[PDB]
């Protein structure tokens, strides 16, 4: 994308809840283009989060997400032979793109049982600032502060 600029691509909303937020989350963990299966998993994983939390469907999905989305993240920015990295603030629309990713990646580890179960554990951990997904944020959050000299 040197000359080009790209506006956006439209996404179908989630069927139970007319929110585009839960619609992209289904896409991220969907593999081999199997949208039905990944949609079942998210529904079998957020059904329990209503049971545990008290918040029902999206305030419960938001609250777990909100403790995982970052504020800054770094990149390699060599100048003329340098090799260091520069912390750069991230736009509000890439936050959820990174936040959902980290949850699903950490869910594929920690193998307990069916994905609908081990994802349910990871989502509930992020509702408490407890799981791996939060640690991945703080690991980035430290490295962005340890290199704060570059800005």
């Amino acid at each position: 994308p040197r000359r080009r600029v790209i506006g956006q691509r439209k996404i179908l909303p989630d069927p139970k809840f007319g929110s585009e937020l839960l619609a992209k989350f289904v896409n991220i963990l969907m593999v081999d283009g199997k949208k039905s299966t990944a949609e079942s998993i998210v529904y079998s994983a957020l059904e329990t989060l209503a049971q545990r939390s008290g918040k029902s469907e999206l305030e419960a999905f938001e609250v777990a997400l909100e403790n995982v989305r970052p504020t800054v993240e770094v990149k390699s920015r060599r100048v003329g032979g340098s090799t260091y990295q520069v912390p750069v603030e991230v736009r509000p629309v890439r936050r959820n793109a990174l936040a959902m990713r980290w949850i699903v990646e950490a869910a594929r580890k920690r193998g307990d049982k069916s994905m609908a179960l081990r994802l349910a554990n990871e989502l509930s951990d992020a509702a408490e600032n407890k799981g791996t997904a939060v640690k991945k944020r703080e690991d980035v959050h430290r490295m962005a502060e340890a290199n704060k000299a570059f800005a």
Partner: protein, 76 residues
């Protein structure tokens, strides 16, 4: 490996090697220790004990796990 305070009487020179040995160990390791510096170089998770038979499992070394334990909100 199960270690109930493996570094009680060891000096730091011998303890330094044990930190490197246990770190590189490929297999499973469950270790118990009451000091701070030693668990920041060998372990990546904690099972922090609480009263009433409740165990809270946090992620990271000692200091990282205690960090999540300040910010706990316990899923209202």
């Amino acid at each position: 490996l199960i270690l109930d305070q493996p570094t009680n009487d060891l000096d730091v020179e011998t303890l330094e090697l044990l930190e490197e040995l246990i770190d590189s160990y490929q297999g499973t390791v469950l270790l118990v220790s009451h000091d701070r510096q030693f668990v920041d170089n060998t372990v990546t998770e904690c099972w922090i004990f609480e009263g009433g038979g409740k165990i809270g499992r946090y992620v990271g070394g000692y200091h990282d796990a205690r960090g999540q334990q300040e910010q706990y909100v316990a899923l209202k």
